[PDB]
Structures are given as C-alpha cells and as structure tokens.
Design a protein around this nucleic acid. Structure first.
Ligand SMILES: [Mg+2]
Ligand SMILES: [Mg+2]
Ligand SMILES: [Mg+2]
Ligand SMILES: [Mg+2]
Ligand SMILES: [Mg+2]
Ligand SMILES: [Mg+2]
Ligand SMILES: [Mg+2]
Ligand SMILES: [Mg+2]
Ligand SMILES: [Mg+2]
Ligand SMILES: [Mg+2]
Ligand SMILES: [Mg+2]
Ligand SMILES: [Mg+2]
Ligand SMILES: [Mg+2]
Ligand SMILES: [Mg+2]
Ligand SMILES: [Mg+2]
Ligand SMILES: [Mg+2]
Ligand SMILES: [Mg+2]
Ligand SMILES: [Mg+2]
Ligand SMILES: [Mg+2]
Ligand SMILES: [Mg+2]
Ligand SMILES: [Mg+2]
Ligand SMILES: [Mg+2]
Ligand SMILES: [Mg+2]
Ligand SMILES: [Mg+2]
Ligand SMILES: [Mg+2]
Ligand SMILES: [Mg+2]
Ligand SMILES: [Mg+2]
Ligand SMILES: [Mg+2]
Ligand SMILES: [Mg+2]
Ligand SMILES: [Mg+2]
Ligand SMILES: [Mg+2]
Ligand SMILES: [Mg+2]
Ligand SMILES: [Mg+2]
Ligand SMILES: [Mg+2]
Ligand SMILES: [Mg+2]
Ligand SMILES: [Mg+2]
Ligand SMILES: [Mg+2]
Ligand SMILES: [Mg+2]
Ligand SMILES: [Mg+2]
Ligand SMILES: [Mg+2]
Lengths: 261, 181
RNA sequence: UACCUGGUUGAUCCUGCCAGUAGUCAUAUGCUUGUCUCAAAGAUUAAGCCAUGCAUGUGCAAGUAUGAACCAAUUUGAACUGUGAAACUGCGAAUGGCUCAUUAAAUCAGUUAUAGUUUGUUUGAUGGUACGUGCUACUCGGAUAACCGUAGUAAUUCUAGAGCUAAUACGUGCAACAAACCCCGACUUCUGGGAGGGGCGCAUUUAUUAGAUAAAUCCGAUGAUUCAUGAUAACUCGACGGAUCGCACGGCCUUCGUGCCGGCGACGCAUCAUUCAAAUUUCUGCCCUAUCAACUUUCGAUGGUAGGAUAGGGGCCUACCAUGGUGGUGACGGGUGACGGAGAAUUAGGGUUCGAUUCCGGAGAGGGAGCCUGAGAAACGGCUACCACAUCCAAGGAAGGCAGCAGGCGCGCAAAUUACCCAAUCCUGACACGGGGAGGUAGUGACAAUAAAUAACAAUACCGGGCGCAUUAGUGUCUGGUAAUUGGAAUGAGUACAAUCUAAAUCCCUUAACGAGGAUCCAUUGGAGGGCAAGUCUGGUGCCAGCAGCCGCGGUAAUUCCAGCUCCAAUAGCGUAUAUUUAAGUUGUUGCAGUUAAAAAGCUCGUAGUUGGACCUUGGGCCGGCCGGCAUCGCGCUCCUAGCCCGGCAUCGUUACUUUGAAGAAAUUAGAGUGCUCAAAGCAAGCCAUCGCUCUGGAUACAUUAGCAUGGGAUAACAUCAUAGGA
RNA sequence: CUCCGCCGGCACCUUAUGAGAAAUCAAAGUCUUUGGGUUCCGGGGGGAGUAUGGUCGCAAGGCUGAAACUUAAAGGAAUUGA
RNA sequence: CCCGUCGCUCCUACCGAUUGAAUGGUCCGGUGAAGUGUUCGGAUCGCGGCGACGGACGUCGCGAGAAGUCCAUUGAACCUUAUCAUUUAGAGGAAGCAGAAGUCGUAACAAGGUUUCCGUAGGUGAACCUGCGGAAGGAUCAUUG
RNA sequence: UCUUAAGGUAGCCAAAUGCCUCGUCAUCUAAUUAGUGACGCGCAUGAAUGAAUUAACGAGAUUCCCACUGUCCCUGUCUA
C-alpha cells in the first residue's frame, strides 16, 4: 500500500509464537529492531504468554514501564521489542536471568542461566569490511557493529561479547567440526557437529551436520550457528540437548514416563 | 471479525438411496433395539465408522516399518482400546476394519446404563440420562451418546442429587408429602 | 457405500437421451419451530444516490507559561513554587477499515535479483579545524500565536487590522590540540636537506593513483567489480559539525565567593550498518474464442550510441543510426454476469465446477486528470480544475463525495441496530493516564453447523403368540397395543430469591420457592399407481376441476384430482426454484465410440506436430552380519577433505526421468495429545497435603508445477571421429 | 499341361476356442485380464448443412457454419403375428 | 402407416429500403480548464551603510517576496468525423415449430403397385417426374443344368 | 366448362410503359400530386421489338442531405 504496515494479524504471525487463534484479531507486531523480526519474539510474548507475570496488554505495560525488564545489559521499555536468538533477558527484582534459545521442535525456550553465564552474550557476525578512514569493522546478525576487529575474525564466525567491556573476548571460527545449531527452517533447534561443508559458485553454501547420536542432516548457511569449538558448547543447552527426536521416540518417552508412575 | 475463524463441520450424511426396504428395516432394527431419538444418531455412527475405516484403509495400504504407518496405527489402536471398542489380544489394525456400527452403539451411555442395570428399560435409561440423574466420576452427564471409555465404565453411577441415588426427594415427592402433611 | 431406477416395443437385445436418486461453508422462497452451543448476514442487480450522528487526534519529571484559571498562600526580598485548560512547536493522520469497478503474462503464486535503488523510526557503532596570520573559542535578534481590543460578512475550524510576550518554531553565529600528511617556499650549505613561515573536518562532484605474488622481503571482501577503503588536486554561495530541556545534589577553597567542579537521563543534527519495508525485477505457470492469421513501426515499435529525468536500472523521454520484435508452441484481436492466490463443494482413483467475502498481494474512493506537505500519498474521513449529481444563499457567494460504522431511497429473488464499550487484541500520540464504529459486547438472525426434549415405569384389564401339563386346557412371558384406562415417581420448557457472568448490563453455568393427566407444556413437512416406502379404503367430481419431475390419471365403480380415516419417509425439520457436483465409462489420459444405431476425409502427396527397429561390461567372484569395499585386462592428477609408500580429488557434452535434502506463511485439510459433561469445537490443561508450586504441551504430515542441491544412468531426445584439425 | 513349395495379390468355403446389440466378422479377434503409433471424426431427434460472416467459383455451387425454438423419443438388430 | 402444398391460430428467428435509432467505448484532429517546472516581472519588507544632514529625506545594502506574464510538460473536458460492440424499429418477403375434428392428391413402407436411394440438371399445384453416372441399404449371393 | 395456333413462361412495375390515379402501405418532411422501397386481375409489362440486373463513365433526366451563398426576406451602395 502507501506506507509501512503497522498492524499484524494473529494468523499472519510467525508459527513459532504458539499464540492461539480466537485470542483476537491482531498480534503484537514486533517493532523494527536488531533482529530479523520474523525470527524474533516481542517482550510481550516473553512476559504474558510464557512467564505469565501479567495477564493483559496493560499489565505487561506496567511491567515494562517499571524499568525492571532489562535486556542484554540495558533496560528496554518497548513492548514489541524483537528479542531473539541468544538475547539474554534479566530481571533484577527476581534476580532471575533467562537466555532465549531454540528448542528442538522449532520454537523458543527461555533457559535460565546463572550470573556468570549471563554477564555476556554470543552472536555470529554478518561481515567484516572497512569504514571511514580505513578503520575495519564487523557487522553481526544482532546488528551490532564492532570496530577494530581482531585480524583473524572473519565472516560467518561467532563472537562473545561482555556487557561491561562491551567488546570481543573470544571468537569461534566457523569451520568444519565445531558444534552448531540450526536457527531456521525445519532443522532449527537441533544442535550438532558440522561434518561437511560444500560450496557451489553463486548460491547458498550447504552445511552437513551430524547430531550427537548418529542422525545427519543439511542446512543453508544463513541458518547455522556455531556455538562452541569442538563438541563442547559454550552455552547452557535446554532440557533436550539439541537432539530432535522422532515422533515415535517421543511417544515412547511419554509411554515410559507413564509406566514409571 | 474474529470468531469467523472458529471451525465447525457436519457429523452425518443422509443416505444415497432414500427408500429401500432392506436398509430401512435394518435401521429400524438398530434404532428400536438401542432406543434412539431418531436415525440422525445412527447416521453419525456410520459417519464416524466411515472416518476411522478410511484412516485404517489408508494405513493398511502402506507397508510396515513405515514410521507413518506405525505412528497413527498405534494412535488409532490406543484410541480404540481406550474406548474398549476392541478386545484384548485383538490389536492388529484389521479388527478396526472388522468392527461395525453395533460396536459404537454398544458404547453409548444409554446402553451402558441398561447393561449395568439401574434403568429397567433402555428408554428409561435415556430419560434417566437426560434428567441429570447420572454422573461418571463426579460430573452429571446428560448426553446419551457420551461414548464412555472403559476407564470410566466401572464407576458410572447415579448423581448425588438425583432422588434415586443422591439426596433430596423430587418435586412430585414433595408435593405429595406436603399435601399429606 | 467404486450402486443404479421408470420411459421408444406385441414382447426381446441395444445405441441413446429424458426423468428419477444424493450433496452444496449455495442463495431465494414456502410451511413449521420448545432448549443448549456455535455465527454468515446489500457481493451477485445499482463501483447507483445519500439526510443524520460517529469513525484520528495527541502531554510527559523531562521543547514553549506571572498572556487568562485551580490548588498551595509571602517574615511582602523572589518565585510562578505545584495542578495545568487555550495556543505555538513536534509527531501520526500514507495504519485501520470497505469494495472488486478497471485489469487475462498484466496483477498473483512459487522462485530470484538490486554489484541498479530510496527507507521517519528501532538497535549498534560513529563525528576535530565553525576560523586564529591552524602557536587551544571570539556575541546573544524581533514576531509570532494563544490573550486584550476594533471590526466586515447572512454565512463556514470565513476573514483584515492595532497592542502584548517565547522557543528544541525561525534566523544568526565562539570552536578541542601535535596538525598527521599535501603544495608553495626566504636563506643557510649544496642539501637526499635544515628548513623560517603561507595555504588542508565532515558531506558534494569531478579527475589521478593505490588497492599487492607464481615454484628456486606482499597486508580486507566477492561466485564475480575500476569493490570496501586510502592519498591527492581541487569544488559547493554546504544540508551539517548542540545558543535545547530534566531531576539528585555534593567531595574539596584558587580570591573560601551556589566557589575547582561533576554523574544519570530527555530531545536533536549528520554517516554507516541493522530492522521495518517499498520499488523495480528473472524463470515457469491462468478461463473461452480462428465466424480473432497476421500484429508492431512515420507519432517508440526492437535494438545500438550519447544524454535528459528518476532514488535508481530501462525507449521512461530526447537526438542520431540500424530494420528489427511477436506469431499454428495461437501473437494481435474479441468475450468474460473475470480482482489473483491460500482455498470451497463434490470426490474410489483421475477429475468437474467454484473462489465478492474477515489471511496475503493488487486496484479504486462518482468519472478522469494534476499537485502541496511529508521518510512514506499521485492520499480523496488532503487540496486544484473539468464532467455528472446535489446542498445553503439574505441571490454577491459558499460547502461538497458513507465501495468506513449505523441508517434512509432505489435496484431487485435476494441481505440486520441510526445500540454499548475501550475491559480484552492490538494500533496510535509528546504518551504507564488520551484516542480508537479497528476491534470486542449486546439486539434482529431456522445463512450454515452442534448437542438435543415432546414422556417413563408398574400392576388392572376385551384381549394377543409360546413358555409351567400341553392334552383338554387355559391365561403367560418379553408386555405388544385400543385403553382420555388406575397409580404414585422423574424432570426441564417456562416463572423466578439470589449469586455468578459482564467495562455495565444480557445469555450461558449453579440454584430458595413455583412449574405435567395427556384435551395438554398439542410436530411438522411432504407423499400413499410405477420409479418409490406407504390404501385392488370411503364420499364428491366426471377428459371438467385438477394432478403429474417422466410413464401417465380423470370420457359416472378415479388405487393418481378434491376431501375424511389409516399409513409412510424425514423429523425441529422438510418441500419448492435456479446454478453446480455426483449419476456420467452420456467428454472417456486412467476410460467411450465411427460396417449397419451419430460418426473414416473420394484419394494420394505433404511441412510443422506426434511416434520412431536392433547393438555399447559392471560379465564372474571374494568379503561381513539390503549394502559398504574389494579385485579382475581401473587415461593421470599436483590443491581442501589427504593411510596405521597408501581408500574416497577440482575444471575440460547437454537434458528428461528418478532418489534424497533444503527452503517451504499461517488459517483450511489430513493427522498426534488433550473428558469444553459429549459434539461441533478450542489449544488448552493435568497432578501436588489438589497450603505460598510442580510437570507442561501448544506435535506431525501434505504442499502437484517452476527454481536450488546430492546419488543413479535403466528408459527416452538432442549434438556428434573418419578430411583425424584425434589421444 | 500334371505335381509339390515359397512369397505378393483379389477373394472364397468350414468352425468358435474369440468378438459383437445381434445381423454377422478369420479380421469388426488379441477390450473392464481395458495402453503399438498416428490422422480425421460423433455426443438424443429436429431446426439444418439452414441464417449470418468468411472464402473459393463465370454461374450452378463448394469448403468453413451457429442460434432461437421445439421435442420423448427418433433410431439399429433380431422374434412372433398380420 | 404415411409425404408435401394450400387455409386458419399462436410462438421463435431470418432477410429487409429506411445516409434507421439508442447506449457505451476507441482513434485522429480542433479547442483547451488546471497544476508542475521556466522567463521576465517587482505590489511590500528587512543593517533602515552615506550626506556626521533635522522621527524625516535622497543617494541603499543586497536579500526575500505576491499579482501578473512567458515557454514548455502532464493534461482533464467539450466538439466534428470515422469506427467497433450491445440492444432496438421497420412496409414487405420468406423459414421453422406447435395446434385443430380442414382442402388437394398417393410420393414412401409388399415387386407399395413405375424397385429404392445417391450426385447433378431441367420441369410440375403438391407430394414428385425425367435425363446422365453410381449403389443395394434389392425383388438376384446361382449357368456346369 | 367454352375456346385458341398458342393462351404472357423466367422475370418485372403506377417503371420514360397504370386510364382509374394525388393507387394502398412504409420512409423522407411541420406539411409532399414529387423521390425511394414494397404490394400487382397489369386500360395497354415481358424476353435478341431482346427480359432482369449491372461496377465505371455521362455538358443525360429526377429526389434528398452537408457546405455555400443577395435566389429570397429587402433592399443598399460602389466602379467602368
Ligand atoms: Mg490497507
Ligand atoms: Mg463414480
Ligand atoms: Mg422405435
Ligand atoms: Mg406400449
Ligand atoms: Mg437430471
Ligand atoms: Mg461483480
Ligand atoms: Mg456510490
Ligand atoms: Mg542510458
Ligand atoms: Mg470485473
Ligand atoms: Mg485485502
Ligand atoms: Mg488509495
Ligand atoms: Mg485520488
Ligand atoms: Mg468517507
Ligand atoms: Mg454503510
Ligand atoms: Mg399431511
Ligand atoms: Mg396430495
Ligand atoms: Mg388422497
Ligand atoms: Mg411400494
Ligand atoms: Mg411435483
Ligand atoms: Mg402420485
Ligand atoms: Mg457413448
Ligand atoms: Mg451412419
Ligand atoms: Mg474410404
Ligand atoms: Mg515430418
Ligand atoms: Mg445431436
Ligand atoms: Mg430394423
Ligand atoms: Mg405409392
Ligand atoms: Mg414406387
Ligand atoms: Mg423396397
Ligand atoms: Mg417431365
Ligand atoms: Mg417427357
Ligand atoms: Mg432390405
Ligand atoms: Mg406472370
Ligand atoms: Mg403495373
Ligand atoms: Mg421537394
Ligand atoms: Mg416505385
Ligand atoms: Mg400486354
Ligand atoms: Mg405484348
Ligand atoms: Mg422469343
Ligand atoms: Mg414491345
């Protein structure tokens, strides 16, 4: 039409928001922000629909305008903020930290972390290039721009950032054999170790990953995300250690949980 | 305008050939012998049977070791076993095709009341259902097509408010009593 | 449920249609209607016309206050202290909503691309020189609304003038080094210089130069660039580089001087990136029509070059040149009662028909056309002009746009309230407070869909079939019923204390007392010849009235009409009309037929099209329990994957087909879990001692065609080692 | 000219084990156990090979070719009777 | 059983002089509102330089700035012709159908009383007749008698 | 049924051929004895006395429409 669309209808909402169908006509319409806004969750979905600390739009407004809800080292009072992958959401009054990760079935969990693994975050880089006066800088998929990059940190790689020094402390070089976890598509959620990476001139680079227990799959580059060097992750995985389990297997889990009680 | 989005569908289908002696008298056999309100209830039963048999037919079309086969084969079989609609040692996914509308009609709550006694008639069973006289665990049920599961079958019993099995006597009782007193 | 039935005949076997049969989230209508849940509703005809009212405005501690108010109230110094209505300023009004008129490779879907672009905002990072002869900043302008006052006009958020007073409105204007380097350049000593002093932020444009290799001291990206970026010479009458606003005070004297100072924010300028997007754009795909075979091109058609314009590519436009572009693989043209898609109905499979409509995209706001502001508009709840329509006029003038909500007229077979509300879902603003006919709630609502009442149970009876002997009886078991017979039980329809529900009521769910004698708390719709279920009943009519989908009935004994009894099918539903699906193997690719039932061209040639004979090693083995790897009579590999000399390595014919993988919007459908009491549904909810919390789920599938990617080479097309110009 | 055999012709006689509504057919078979390739062509009977348009022809006419409306049968094969 | 003409009633469509008519579009040309951009233009309004002059004056500093106007460009809207398409009128001519209890015949079905019929040509009130060639869907599957 | 040698065929028409006649109907016009197109029992149409059409052409005859005009309303004036 004749400008930006400022309403979002619940059915048009991303499928991983889980939100119901007769709940209304409209959805939170996540504001423009630092993350892709189709791969994100508004802090209203973080508060009302997952943690249930409120029960209405206006009560979530009270939550956020109290200045309690602090994201990534700094309080964000916007109620449609596109919080997404490894954004850390802290609450001083509850002294309670959360970190937003994919779970194996393609959705977002809020995994609790203690303070030491909440002092910092971890994100991949979009691309590193020069700027004014020849000073190099790199761009992350969180949008952050970092100047004077370590001369070895390259594109597609991963970098840890503290919230006080607010710069790089270490980086994982995206390469063969380091644990990744896909962040988009049908394979999203599953962690695994890269086992192969083939490139075709002029198209998306394909990443073949193997899970911790035998299964193998493939993914496009924009979706994969190294976590740690080697098999060991540098982040606390959720209750499913990044293994997507077949529906038969997950039926057996619930059957066994039934027959164990 | 939301609430347009709440789905809804049809539950039976009127038969193809309207006037057949064979089908007409077979359906009267069933309706009278289960004491039903009309033949709409019967036609819902053939509709549910048609649904489950279509699913089972498509499942049997495939071959074993196919994860789609195993999953909703097992789902359909556990649904049947929860409704007790198959017997023990009979889970084969073909005995689902074998079953017929008598099986569903036999699980309706009227029938279960009749077979547990407590009715003295199947039409008396239906009415007792609709005058709030019967609960299942604790909740009084008034839908004679309640389709009881076997895990609820054992303790289908009167309400705590019906005059027969619960508390105070009914309004006819209390009129007769107060005019006697 | 992958189905048939009546009608050509004296009868038979057919081709064959006619009629029957069933559905429609498919409309109208007719009859009828007690309860619960759910919920389409002026699309088809008129994208016809509109009275009235509303639908977009906005206020924080943080841009502007003794202009006029309210609350504090003054030691009568200063505040305007605190609440602020009006107004300036800023932002939004480019979303929402409504409709489907125009539009048939166009929009649209899947899939690309922007290295060919703009993007308020978010988020993150970022920013010297304003002149001083680069030797540390150098000065503060009135006027304007609101108010007060004088007015025209019949008049409208029509309008002139006087007096006041602000800025984060407007307009000026202080600048943080060594100058790093760049070019001039006195003289010294001779210079390869010392150089004394004179010229240089960031954006804009132009131009130069760099932005590095290959085996016997080179340093970013791409699949791909003169890319990112740097240096230079300049260039602009430079947009910019903060004269802004909040609280909390609180270490310490240099002149003990609000004193040296200092943090946390709000707003704002510009650059880059991000994001919200947009705009273009690649490939493939759309209904009927040949009584639409040529269309385009002087005047843009197709391309080239140069430019202009755009944010940007581009005949988008201009000048010149070339003579091209599309088509029997259907162009151009015409129809469409044609917005596209997700999808809907029906479906054994395949299909057929539909899709105005709540989700996405596009297009319009009576019909065209043109623009302001703004980041965003060719906006219409913005303007300008014309045309059609129409309102007020005090007769000069003025205001217009319901295909927004509701409502009125008309058109029609056809479609409800001029209601309530911001509480939910979200949007919006300067913003925790305002606003929101978006959206929700309620009234009409047999559109469609769900559960589902209208009695039940007992002995009595003329009775009615065995069963206890079953003769010879007689009464006997489930009770079968004509029983308004007799009888006490059960209840919700309804009424209703109350509570609950609700933004407030209302409904539902609970439930004080009331609420059944069978006449009522009364079920209808259609039919009773065949199909097709149910009268060789009775009365009336007499080829009439009429019925009848078709075959047929009615000419005084009507199974067919009009009536009553009885009955039947469905049952709170059913009939009727049209359209459409099935039937229909009567559109047939699966899957029809052409001797005679409709249909082989009179016959041959013939281009496209369709279809195309056979032939090419995985031939035999090991090996371990459908396949890895092996060897045999395996063109080589240097390089990443590369053995405890060595598996499994690049480039040097295409496709189809096929396997697997990725990406694939939800809603719809299939389908997992889940006792809304069931069910349609919904996405919840379930268990703790159901005492200050646990466990959570919110699966999964499908998605043909086009595109990308991996394994195979059977099958099928194309191209082609005989000139050897071969290896 | 007699005999025997090959092909390629034009046909014929007998039989279903086939096909067909049958009449009949050794090709009208190898068809619901439905798929060698290809062209033309039919969708109940009329209106009608008509009107209109096009096109060819000296003309007669040829090729291409509807609709409205109407109708419940028209038609094929065989049986008996008259 | 049955074919056609003629007579009558009704329905549907056809041809048809009428420079037929109406509605809606499209193209060329004429005229051209309005906006945007552009040229001149300069109503007033800003240090109110200087005369060292008595709130005034001229030399005034340049910058703003409206009406108007010029030229382009987009271009509504009207007008004339052409033409397309959809409906509609038409004296007369002539088809098809349906109806009825009509008139004239006897064409066809048997060897239908002249075997039928196909193509073509001519004629006749009507069916039809005849000429030339063809077919059997014939009344002959047959001349070694 | 009389009669002829034969009984006006194909066509065509109030035609330059139709007396009745200003034929009847439609069209054109405000109004039409005119024009065209049809109707034909045609005083007295008609087939090489050639019949019916017929594009082009015509100092041929007739009707209408547009432009144009002192032909006219209605005259005035100028020049040789
Ligand atoms: Mg919109
Ligand atoms: Mg079928
Ligand atoms: Mg017949
Ligand atoms: Mg008969
Ligand atoms: Mg039918
Ligand atoms: Mg429409
Ligand atoms: Mg309108
Ligand atoms: Mg160019
Ligand atoms: Mg349309
Ligand atoms: Mg839409
Ligand atoms: Mg618009
Ligand atoms: Mg507009
Ligand atoms: Mg409006
Ligand atoms: Mg309205
Ligand atoms: Mg009745
Ligand atoms: Mg009747
Ligand atoms: Mg009757
Ligand atoms: Mg019957
Ligand atoms: Mg009827
Ligand atoms: Mg009948
Ligand atoms: Mg057929
Ligand atoms: Mg034939
Ligand atoms: Mg032939
Ligand atoms: Mg060929
Ligand atoms: Mg036909
Ligand atoms: Mg016959
Ligand atoms: Mg005869
Ligand atoms: Mg004869
Ligand atoms: Mg004969
Ligand atoms: Mg003759
Ligand atoms: Mg003769
Ligand atoms: Mg014969
Ligand atoms: Mg004559
Ligand atoms: Mg005459
Ligand atoms: Mg005249
Ligand atoms: Mg004449
Ligand atoms: Mg004569
Ligand atoms: Mg004569
Ligand atoms: Mg002669
Ligand atoms: Mg003569």
């Amino acid at each position: 039409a004749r400008g930006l669309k400022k309403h979002l209808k619940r059915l048009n909402a991303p499928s991983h928001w889980m939100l119901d169908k007769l709940g209304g006509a409209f959805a939170p319409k996540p504001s423009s922000g630092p993350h892709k806004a189709r791969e994100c969750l508004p802090l209203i979905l973080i508060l009302r629909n997952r943690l249930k600390y409120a029960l209405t739009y206006r009560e979530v407004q009270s939550i956020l305008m109290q200045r309690h809800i602090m994201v990534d080292g700094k309080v964000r009072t916007d109620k449609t903020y596109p919080a997404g992958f490894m954004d850390i959401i802290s609450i001083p009054k509850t002294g309670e930290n959360y970190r937003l990760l994919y779970d194996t079935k393609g959705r977002f969990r809020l995994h609790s972390v203690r303070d030491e693994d909440a002092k910092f975050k971890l994100c991949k880089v979009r691309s590193v290039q020069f700027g004014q006066k020849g000073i190099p800088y790199l761009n992350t998929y969180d949008g952050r721009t970092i100047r004077y990059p370590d001369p070895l940190i390259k594109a597609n790689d991963t970098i840890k950032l503290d919230l006080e020094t607010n710069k790089i402390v270490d980086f994982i070089k995206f390469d063969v054999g380091n644990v990744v976890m896909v962040t988009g598509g049908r394979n999203t959620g599953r962690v695994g170790v890269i086992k192969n990476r083939e490139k075709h001139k002029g198209t998306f680079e394909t990443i073949h990953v193997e899970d911790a227990q035998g299964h193998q799959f493939a993914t496009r580059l924009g979706n994969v995300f190294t976590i740690g060097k080697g098999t060991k992750p540098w982040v606390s995985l959720p209750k499913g250690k990044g293994i997507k389990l077949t529906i038969i297997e997950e039926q057996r889990k619930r059957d066994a949980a039934a027959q164990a009680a | 305008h939301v609430n347009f989005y709440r789905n809804y569908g049809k539950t039976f289908k009127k038969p193809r050939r309207p006037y057949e002696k064979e089908r007409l008298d077979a359906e009267l056999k069933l309706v009278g012998e289960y004491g039903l309100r009309c033949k709409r209830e019967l036609w819902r039963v053939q509709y549910a049977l048609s649904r489950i048999r279509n699913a089972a037919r498509h499942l049997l079309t495939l071959d074993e070791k196919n994860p789609r086969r195993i999953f909703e084969g097992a789902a359909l079989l556990r649904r049947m076993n929860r409704y007790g609609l198959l017997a023990e040692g009979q889970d084969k996914l073909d005995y689902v095709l074998a079953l017929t509308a008598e099986n569903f009609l036999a699980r309706r709550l009227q029938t279960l009341v009749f077979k547990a006694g407590m009715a003295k008639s199947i039409h008396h069973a239906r009415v007792l259902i609709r005058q709030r006289h019967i609960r299942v665990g604790r909740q009084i049920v008034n839908v004679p097509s309640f389709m009881v599961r076997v895990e609820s079958e054992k303790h289908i019993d009167f309400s705590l408010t019906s005059p027969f099995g619960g508390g105070p006597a009914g309004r006819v009782k209390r009129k007769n009593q107060k005019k006697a007193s």
